[PDB]
RNA sequence: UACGGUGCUGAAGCAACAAAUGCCCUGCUUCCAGGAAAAGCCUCUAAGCAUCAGGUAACAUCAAAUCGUACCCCAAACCG
RNA sequence: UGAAGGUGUACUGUGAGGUAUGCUGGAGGUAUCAGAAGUGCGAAUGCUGACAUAAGUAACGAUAAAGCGGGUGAAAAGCCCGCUCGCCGGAAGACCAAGGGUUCCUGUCCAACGUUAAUCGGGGCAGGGUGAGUCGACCCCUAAGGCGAGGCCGAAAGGCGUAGUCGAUGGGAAACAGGUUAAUAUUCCUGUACUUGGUGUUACUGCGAAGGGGGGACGGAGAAGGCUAUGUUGGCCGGGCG
RNA sequence: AGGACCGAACCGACUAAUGUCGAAAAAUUAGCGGAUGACUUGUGGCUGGGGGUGAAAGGCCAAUCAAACCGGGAGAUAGCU
RNA sequence: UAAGGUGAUAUGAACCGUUAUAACCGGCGAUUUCCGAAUGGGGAAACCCAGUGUGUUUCGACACACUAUCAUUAACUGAAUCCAUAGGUUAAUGAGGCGAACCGGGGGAACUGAAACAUCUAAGUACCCCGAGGAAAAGAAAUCAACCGAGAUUCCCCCAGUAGCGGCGAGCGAACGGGGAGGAGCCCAGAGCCUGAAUCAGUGUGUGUGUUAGUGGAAGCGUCUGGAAAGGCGCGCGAUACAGGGUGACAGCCCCGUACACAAAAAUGCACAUGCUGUGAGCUCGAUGAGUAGGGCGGGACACGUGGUAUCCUGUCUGAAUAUGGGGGGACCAUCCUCCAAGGCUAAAUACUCCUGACUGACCGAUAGUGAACCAGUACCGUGAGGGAAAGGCGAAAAGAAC
């Protein structure tokens, strides 16, 4: 009966993507964290 | 016209039923080309290396299959094939 | 500077083939030689469909550790430790006690 | 930003103490005003955002002497 | 072969590059995939012999 | 006839009537709540330029790259 | 010539314990007196793994429905072929977008996965399969809106915004019929077309934007008229005489 | 003409029974309300936590809301078990 | 360096070598796709799309370079408007982003404690931001002291839980003085006779002696159990080497090391000569930091909560004397004493360890030790930020079980 995740790759990338993160001071720090932790998938891309 | 590099375009001839049926009946050759490799470059390469009269080149990108074996996933490389149609002066 | 090497008559110091002598077939990277007629192991070779398919047991020459073998002197008539020295420009081996060159 | 071009007076912080000494954070902004100064060296008006005390430094020194110090730091006016 | 290839002309040394690419690499690459080639070692040494030349003709 | 078919042939291939929520219709009447933008496109000339450069037709010849193209898609392949 | 550990047995101390030893085990162990503690577990709806119980119990996911004959096979209610029966048919059909991401197709295999079996499968394992000037994206323009040189503003971070530049869900050139593959087809083939560019010849001639104008270019409802998709019935054609 | 009428799609959710270790962390079945409008829906945008948004119910803001979620202060503190 | 090499799971196939042109390990290079500050414009990172010139080309078009922004600098130039300025062009140089902690600044909580709570505490703590450097800050007295004296700064030990501060509660808590580590000083607000002298400054430059490859490197034997001897027993031998690890059980002498003796074509880190684009001592003479010190007002910092409250900082409004001058000595005053503010610079002792090398543990030994001994920040979970596992061991040798 209509769940929360209703996927859309445009929305996904525009919202959470690499360039979306790069755009902002705080979004750049997220990447700096995921790199510091050492994640394989740095963003969803 | 693009000397030296033309040699790097054509990787190998492709072997299949669909490839074979298109030898005699359609007068084409199917072949694995470089991931770059434009239809002009494939044509110009066949025109020099194989040295035959090319009518037109059709091209596509084949997606690699995800082969999970043992306990690890691993996908094949994406490779590009080119159906190269030949003129009436044909051989191989 | 490997002390035991390719075309070299050795004698076995330890193991079921203690006292036997033979030539080295090939030294391995791991530090193990394959001396002929020494570690004879009776392998059960499975008849693989492709190429040859004999189907039978075979006495293969297994590997032995380098420290289990010493070069045969052929003068004293026993095992001897190897050294290294510079005779002429090149480096060469020698027997400790009865200082000869190989 | 609320910064005097002459003195460099910027907004400092501090408390706003009540009768019962309830410390609540505040700011002390400086008395800034965009004012036009006649530079008699090159015959024109120069607009500067200065504190009231800035104006007194410009009165005490020369406008050209202050602009000389402003130009050394790498500013515009 | 390097010591011999080093003493060559800048125009003449291209002809060896083009000869290494023209046949050899291409021919063996096409012959390998068709299943006519037994000697697989040739693919390696040709690729290294190109690199040698393409290194050698970067003199400026 | 591998029982799959496959090359060969291959007749008629019209008229009436009914008929859309499609199309004409970005129409028409009509109403008040008064109904995107910008290029492509046609047109006009300044700054310019005058046996130039451009346009115009008719023609010939090239050129049209690259990526997607399987499959499911009111579902066992999506979200649960 | 058998350590620790495991497992029994027999002695033994007031107790926590200790000693000896059979079997298993196959390389460690440690007297003594000292020294130091991650020093002792039955509970904390403690924590992790294992394993019970209920129990061979409920359940096996729409009450659209099966039946039989033959085939393959170690085995067939379920797979294949056939013939009946049934159910959907503004869908439970057929194409798409989004979203998945090889599930497609072929051969092969039945451990696990499938709420049963499985010779079957969207399962395992190999190998194939996605062909475009015209379909879509790309590109061209823009909406809401995002970003935004200078800028204005803000302790710093940054905020807003001009020129611009992005941003479709909208506007903007052109391809259709039939044939074909185990699997693609407005893409391959055959038959007919069409569009926008670049580039040479001829005969003419007043051309050129960051500009002007036109156009693109737009609402709801309603009503009618003509059409077509399509359907029906004759006609013609090929079989049919039960 | 109409926030007109009846009625499918579509949007809803008044009654009942079922279901409640479900077919389903809100559904099914049979009825039920709106159905040219203050309608409905696709695609993309904007508003952010004492903040948003709200034809107002403390409703809604990713199955979480009288103050979201994640990380941190942090082993908060617990005269209690 | 070298007789075995073509990395691993992980074999096969085809090869490559043996006294040196295989592999292997280092120094210096060459290449160095795309994304990413990303920088030609854009963008849903790993894609789309160009401009300009150049140089070839068979109509088709190839190849390589450039082209971000900003900040200084310079030349072209240049609107309202006469002069110029704003602006616009290209070039020179630099900046941009990432990274563990430590460091200095700009902001800056609350839970908590006070047995409630609001001053106070937690605490200038967590966190956010900015800017550095191998350290950073401080720093050569307008400092203390007590009529005695010291002599920049930082860090350690006391002084001392002292004096004080404090809803005089909870709590906060110095300084003087003493002992140590470490030591060092200078430059401008400029005239003199005279001047390259001290000094730090290019860089070469021989040097030293490290770093990045390495080379040599002693001495064991027989019997007894046993699958296997390094073990038992007997006889030896080395030891500037008995650290350690491997080898079919526990090896000084089997192997690899070890002590020790050595070793560089090339690149570099230091420590002395040192030619020097390029840099001034000593003198005399002076000068000696103004919207400044101080004050009023409001805040903050000082152990010190406005209190009798010195001292420091400054948002605000004011405002001296400037060396017969002024600051300080904890309200304030007068004598005595001591210093010279309103401009700068400066090594060492000190803090830290993403990372590199060796070594060490009354540290852990697979529910421990990292989350991660295993291909783990993985599978998996979440739209996302983010969370986040389980999983070690055949044997001495695959001899991994032909039939
Ligand atoms: K039927
Ligand atoms: K705390
Ligand atoms: Mg979104
Ligand atoms: Mg941060
Ligand atoms: Mg994370
Ligand atoms: Mg991800
Ligand atoms: Mg074609
Ligand atoms: Mg294509
Ligand atoms: Mg791959
Ligand atoms: Mg407070
Ligand atoms: Mg004005
Ligand atoms: Mg180069
Ligand atoms: Mg048939
Ligand atoms: Mg009709
Ligand atoms: Mg009908
Ligand atoms: Mg109209
Ligand atoms: Mg036209
Ligand atoms: Mg015209
Ligand atoms: Mg053509
Ligand atoms: Mg073409
Ligand atoms: Mg399709
Ligand atoms: Mg289908
Ligand atoms: Mg279907
Ligand atoms: Mg469908
Ligand atoms: Mg449905
Ligand atoms: Mg369907
Ligand atoms: Mg569910
Ligand atoms: Mg599902
Ligand atoms: Mg015994
Ligand atoms: Mg005994
Ligand atoms: Mg015994
Ligand atoms: Mg025993
Ligand atoms: Mg025994
Ligand atoms: Mg025992
Ligand atoms: Mg023990
Ligand atoms: Mg015991
Ligand atoms: Mg038993
Ligand atoms: Mg028992
Ligand atoms: Mg015993
Ligand atoms: Mg016994
Ligand atoms: Mg036993
Ligand atoms: Mg052991
Ligand atoms: Mg042991
Ligand atoms: Mg022991
Ligand atoms: Mg014991
Ligand atoms: Mg003991
Ligand atoms: Mg102790
Ligand atoms: Mg315990
Ligand atoms: Mg207990
Ligand atoms: Mg227990
Ligand atoms: Mg377990
Ligand atoms: Mg049963
Ligand atoms: Mg029961
Ligand atoms: Mg029952
Ligand atoms: Mg039952
Ligand atoms: Mg059932
Ligand atoms: Mg049933
Ligand atoms: Mg049934
Ligand atoms: Mg039969
Ligand atoms: Mg049978
Ligand atoms: Mg069978
Ligand atoms: Mg049968
Ligand atoms: Mg059979
Ligand atoms: Mg049979
Ligand atoms: Mg049978
Ligand atoms: Mg049967
Ligand atoms: Mg049957
Ligand atoms: Mg059935
Ligand atoms: Mg059937
Ligand atoms: Mg059928
Ligand atoms: Mg029905
Ligand atoms: Mg119907
Ligand atoms: Mg379609
Ligand atoms: Mg899926
Ligand atoms: Mg995919
Ligand atoms: Mg699969
Ligand atoms: Mg299938
Ligand atoms: Mg099968
Ligand atoms: Mg079975
Ligand atoms: Mg199996
Ligand atoms: Mg089953
Ligand atoms: Mg089940
Ligand atoms: Mg199948
Ligand atoms: Mg399958
Ligand atoms: Mg196209
Ligand atoms: Mg069309
Ligand atoms: Mg699109
Ligand atoms: Mg294009
Ligand atoms: Mg355009
Ligand atoms: Mg645009
Ligand atoms: Mg707008
Ligand atoms: Mg805009
Ligand atoms: Mg903006
Ligand atoms: Mg600019
Ligand atoms: Mg600027
Ligand atoms: Mg700006
Ligand atoms: Mg303004
Ligand atoms: Mg902004
Ligand atoms: Mg605009
Ligand atoms: Mg669109
Ligand atoms: Mg169009
Ligand atoms: Mg379109
Ligand atoms: Mg069209
Ligand atoms: Mg058709
Ligand atoms: Mg046809
Ligand atoms: Mg036909
Ligand atoms: Mg199909
Ligand atoms: Mg055609
Ligand atoms: Mg024709
Ligand atoms: Mg014709
Ligand atoms: Mg025509
Ligand atoms: Mg047309
Ligand atoms: Mg045309
Ligand atoms: Mg216009
Ligand atoms: Mg429109
Ligand atoms: Mg309308
Ligand atoms: Mg109406
Ligand atoms: Mg009417
Ligand atoms: Mg009509
Ligand atoms: Mg018709
Ligand atoms: Mg028709
Ligand atoms: Mg009829
Ligand atoms: Mg008949
Ligand atoms: Mg009848
Ligand atoms: Mg109305
Ligand atoms: Mg109505
Ligand atoms: Mg009625
Ligand atoms: Mg009704
Ligand atoms: Mg629907
Ligand atoms: Mg309902
Ligand atoms: Mg509902
Ligand atoms: Mg009722
Ligand atoms: Mg009922
Ligand atoms: Mg129940
Ligand atoms: Mg039930
Ligand atoms: Mg209902
Ligand atoms: Mg009713
Ligand atoms: Mg009704
Ligand atoms: Mg009604
Ligand atoms: Mg909806
Ligand atoms: Mg939306
Ligand atoms: Mg938003
Ligand atoms: Mg909140
Ligand atoms: Mg918050
Ligand atoms: Mg807020
Ligand atoms: Mg508000
Ligand atoms: Mg509402
Ligand atoms: Mg209420
Ligand atoms: Mg909720
Ligand atoms: Mg609620
Ligand atoms: Mg709350
Ligand atoms: Mg709250
Ligand atoms: Mg949330
Ligand atoms: Mg902490
Ligand atoms: Mg707690
Ligand atoms: Mg070596
Ligand atoms: Mg061979
Ligand atoms: Mg060489
Ligand atoms: Mg060499
Ligand atoms: Mg590289
Ligand atoms: Mg960019
Ligand atoms: Mg560049
Ligand atoms: Mg640049
Ligand atoms: Mg770029
Ligand atoms: Mg797009
Ligand atoms: Mg100038
Ligand atoms: Mg002008
Ligand atoms: Mg002018
Ligand atoms: Mg530049
Ligand atoms: Mg440059
Ligand atoms: Mg910087
Ligand atoms: Mg930086
Ligand atoms: Mg700090
Ligand atoms: Mg800091
Ligand atoms: Mg700090
Ligand atoms: Mg602060
Ligand atoms: Mg508090
Ligand atoms: Mg509180
Ligand atoms: Mg309290
Ligand atoms: Mg309390
Ligand atoms: Mg309370
Ligand atoms: Mg701070
Ligand atoms: Mg921070
Ligand atoms: Mg920063
Ligand atoms: Mg250091
Ligand atoms: Mg440095
Ligand atoms: Mg410093
Ligand atoms: Mg300093
Ligand atoms: Mg100072
Ligand atoms: Mg001084
Ligand atoms: Mg002095
Ligand atoms: Mg001093
Ligand atoms: Mg004295
Ligand atoms: Mg003294
Ligand atoms: Mg002293
Ligand atoms: Mg009181
Ligand atoms: Mg404190
Ligand atoms: Mg304390
Ligand atoms: Mg004293
Ligand atoms: Mg002393
Ligand atoms: Mg001292
Ligand atoms: Mg001392
Ligand atoms: Mg010392
Ligand atoms: Mg010292
Ligand atoms: Mg001393
Ligand atoms: Mg010294
Ligand atoms: Mg001195
Ligand atoms: Mg001094
Ligand atoms: Mg001065
Ligand atoms: Mg030395
Ligand atoms: Mg050595
Ligand atoms: Mg040795
Ligand atoms: Mg014996
Ligand atoms: Mg013997
Ligand atoms: Mg005996
Ligand atoms: Mg015996
Ligand atoms: Mg035996
Ligand atoms: Mg022995
Ligand atoms: Mg014994
Ligand atoms: Mg002796
Ligand atoms: Mg020993
Ligand atoms: Mg053992
Ligand atoms: Mg012993
Ligand atoms: Mg011994
Ligand atoms: Mg040892
Ligand atoms: Mg001994
Ligand atoms: Mg020494
Ligand atoms: Mg040297
Ligand atoms: Mg030498
Ligand atoms: Mg050198
Ligand atoms: Mg001074
Ligand atoms: Mg001054
Ligand atoms: Mg003062
Ligand atoms: Mg003051
Ligand atoms: Mg005073
Ligand atoms: Mg004072
Ligand atoms: Mg005052
Ligand atoms: Mg007053
Ligand atoms: Mg005052
Ligand atoms: Mg005051
Ligand atoms: Mg106060
Ligand atoms: Mg205080
Ligand atoms: Mg008092
Ligand atoms: Mg008093
Ligand atoms: Mg005083
Ligand atoms: Mg003075
Ligand atoms: Mg004096
Ligand atoms: Mg004097
Ligand atoms: Mg006086
Ligand atoms: Mg005085
Ligand atoms: Mg003093
Ligand atoms: Mg003082
Ligand atoms: Mg005084
Ligand atoms: Mg006093
Ligand atoms: Mg005092
Ligand atoms: Mg004092
Ligand atoms: Mg006085
Ligand atoms: Mg002074
Ligand atoms: Mg003086
Ligand atoms: Mg002062
Ligand atoms: Mg001072
Ligand atoms: Mg001051
Ligand atoms: Mg000051
Ligand atoms: Mg000073
Ligand atoms: Mg320095
Ligand atoms: Mg130093
Ligand atoms: Mg030590
Ligand atoms: Mg130890
Ligand atoms: Mg330990
Ligand atoms: Mg252990
Ligand atoms: Mg663990
Ligand atoms: Mg264990
Ligand atoms: Mg375990
Ligand atoms: Mg963890
Ligand atoms: Mg996920
Ligand atoms: Mg295990
Ligand atoms: Mg193993
Ligand atoms: Mg083992
Ligand atoms: Mg077996």
mmCIF file of N, CA and C (backbone and C1' of nucleotides) in Angstrom, chain I residues 318-333:
data_model
loop_
_atom_site.group_PDB
_atom_site.id
_atom_site.type_symbol
_atom_site.label_atom_id
_atom_site.label_comp_id
_atom_site.label_asym_id
_atom_site.label_seq_id
_atom_site.Cartn_x
_atom_site.Cartn_y
_atom_site.Cartn_z
ATOM 1 P P U I 318 33.011 62.051 21.291
ATOM 2 O "O5'" U I 318 33.601 62.643 22.650
ATOM 3 C "C5'" U I 318 34.993 62.981 22.807
ATOM 4 C "C4'" U I 318 35.363 62.933 24.271
ATOM 5 C "C3'" U I 318 36.786 63.353 24.611
ATOM 6 O "O3'" U I 318 36.850 64.755 24.882
ATOM 7 C "C1'" U I 318 36.329 61.234 25.579
ATOM 8 P P G I 319 37.897 65.705 24.110
ATOM 9 O "O5'" G I 319 39.286 65.400 24.831
ATOM 10 C "C5'" G I 319 39.445 65.497 26.262
ATOM 11 C "C4'" G I 319 40.633 64.682 26.736
ATOM 12 C "C3'" G I 319 41.922 64.811 25.933
ATOM 13 O "O3'" G I 319 42.667 65.972 26.289
ATOM 14 C "C1'" G I 319 41.452 62.526 26.258
ATOM 15 P P A I 320 43.901 66.452 25.379
ATOM 16 O "O5'" A I 320 44.994 65.321 25.638
ATOM 17 C "C5'" A I 320 46.387 65.631 25.850
ATOM 18 C "C4'" A I 320 46.724 65.593 27.324
ATOM 19 C "C3'" A I 320 48.212 65.695 27.643
ATOM 20 O "O3'" A I 320 48.557 67.062 27.838
ATOM 21 C "C1'" A I 320 47.337 63.744 28.640
ATOM 22 P P A I 321 49.638 67.772 26.899
ATOM 23 O "O5'" A I 321 51.015 67.418 27.616
ATOM 24 C "C5'" A I 321 51.270 67.855 28.965
ATOM 25 C "C4'" A I 321 52.207 66.907 29.677
ATOM 26 C "C3'" A I 321 53.563 66.676 29.021
ATOM 27 O "O3'" A I 321 54.464 67.759 29.230
ATOM 28 C "C1'" A I 321 52.666 64.601 29.666
ATOM 29 P P U I 322 55.655 68.004 28.193
ATOM 30 O "O5'" U I 322 56.367 66.580 28.146
ATOM 31 C "C5'" U I 322 57.194 66.188 27.038
ATOM 32 C "C4'" U I 322 57.383 64.688 27.024
ATOM 33 C "C3'" U I 322 58.223 64.166 25.866
ATOM 34 O "O3'" U I 322 59.576 63.998 26.290
ATOM 35 C "C1'" U I 322 56.110 63.062 25.893
ATOM 36 P P A I 323 60.722 65.034 25.845
ATOM 37 O "O5'" A I 323 61.898 64.712 26.874
ATOM 38 C "C5'" A I 323 62.104 65.496 28.070
ATOM 39 C "C4'" A I 323 62.295 64.608 29.283
ATOM 40 C "C3'" A I 323 63.738 64.228 29.637
ATOM 41 O "O3'" A I 323 63.933 64.362 31.040
ATOM 42 C "C1'" A I 323 62.399 62.295 29.568
ATOM 43 P P U I 324 65.185 65.174 31.617
ATOM 44 O "O5'" U I 324 64.800 65.378 33.151
ATOM 45 C "C5'" U I 324 63.421 65.430 33.583
ATOM 46 C "C4'" U I 324 63.287 66.284 34.824
ATOM 47 C "C3'" U I 324 61.902 66.873 35.075
ATOM 48 O "O3'" U I 324 61.071 66.020 35.855
ATOM 49 C "C1'" U I 324 63.542 68.595 35.165
ATOM 50 P P G I 325 59.477 66.109 35.710
ATOM 51 O "O5'" G I 325 59.215 65.505 34.260
ATOM 52 C "C5'" G I 325 58.249 66.091 33.368
ATOM 53 C "C4'" G I 325 57.896 65.122 32.264
ATOM 54 C "C3'" G I 325 57.141 63.874 32.689
ATOM 55 O "O3'" G I 325 55.752 64.120 32.900
ATOM 56 C "C1'" G I 325 58.899 63.259 31.244
ATOM 57 P P G I 326 55.090 63.865 34.344
ATOM 58 O "O5'" G I 326 54.750 62.309 34.307
ATOM 59 C "C5'" G I 326 53.627 61.822 33.552
ATOM 60 C "C4'" G I 326 53.993 60.595 32.746
ATOM 61 C "C3'" G I 326 53.796 59.263 33.443
ATOM 62 O "O3'" G I 326 52.415 58.916 33.494
ATOM 63 C "C1'" G I 326 55.898 59.259 32.384
ATOM 64 P P G I 327 51.793 58.253 34.819
ATOM 65 O "O5'" G I 327 52.186 56.718 34.656
ATOM 66 C "C5'" G I 327 51.665 55.946 33.556
ATOM 67 C "C4'" G I 327 52.246 54.552 33.547
ATOM 68 C "C3'" G I 327 52.128 53.752 34.834
ATOM 69 O "O3'" G I 327 50.831 53.220 35.092
ATOM 70 C "C1'" G I 327 54.313 53.537 33.996
ATOM 71 P P G I 328 50.287 53.131 36.602
ATOM 72 O "O5'" G I 328 51.170 51.967 37.240
ATOM 73 C "C5'" G I 328 51.135 50.622 36.722
ATOM 74 C "C4'" G I 328 52.200 49.766 37.372
ATOM 75 C "C3'" G I 328 52.212 49.744 38.893
ATOM 76 O "O3'" G I 328 51.212 48.880 39.421
ATOM 77 C "C1'" G I 328 54.401 50.115 38.124
ATOM 78 P P G I 329 50.557 49.175 40.859
ATOM 79 O "O5'" G I 329 51.700 48.725 41.872
ATOM 80 C "C5'" G I 329 52.171 47.366 41.920
ATOM 81 C "C4'" G I 329 53.339 47.255 42.869
ATOM 82 C "C3'" G I 329 53.053 47.647 44.311
ATOM 83 O "O3'" G I 329 52.564 46.515 45.029
ATOM 84 C "C1'" G I 329 55.064 48.684 43.560
ATOM 85 P P G I 330 51.132 46.559 45.750
ATOM 86 O "O5'" G I 330 50.143 46.927 44.558
ATOM 87 C "C5'" G I 330 49.184 47.998 44.669
ATOM 88 C "C4'" G I 330 47.793 47.443 44.863
ATOM 89 C "C3'" G I 330 47.457 46.924 46.262
ATOM 90 O "O3'" G I 330 46.244 47.499 46.731
ATOM 91 C "C1'" G I 330 46.884 45.313 44.630
ATOM 92 P P A I 331 46.255 48.957 47.389
ATOM 93 O "O5'" A I 331 44.995 49.669 46.726
ATOM 94 C "C5'" A I 331 44.542 49.384 45.392
ATOM 95 C "C4'" A I 331 43.258 50.131 45.129
ATOM 96 C "C3'" A I 331 43.418 51.635 44.911
ATOM 97 O "O3'" A I 331 43.594 51.989 43.539
ATOM 98 C "C1'" A I 331 41.798 51.235 46.602
ATOM 99 P P C I 332 44.804 52.951 43.097
ATOM 100 O "O5'" C I 332 44.675 54.179 44.104
ATOM 101 C "C5'" C I 332 43.553 55.081 44.050
ATOM 102 C "C4'" C I 332 43.586 56.059 45.207
ATOM 103 C "C3'" C I 332 44.917 56.743 45.478
ATOM 104 O "O3'" C I 332 45.141 57.796 44.544
ATOM 105 C "C1'" C I 332 44.020 55.968 47.519
ATOM 106 P P C I 333 46.621 58.106 43.998
ATOM 107 O "O5'" C I 333 47.271 58.949 45.184
ATOM 108 C "C5'" C I 333 46.615 60.125 45.698
ATOM 109 C "C4'" C I 333 47.224 60.576 47.005
ATOM 110 C "C3'" C I 333 48.737 60.684 47.058
ATOM 111 O "O3'" C I 333 49.172 61.847 46.364
ATOM 112 C "C1'" C I 333 47.968 59.645 49.025
#
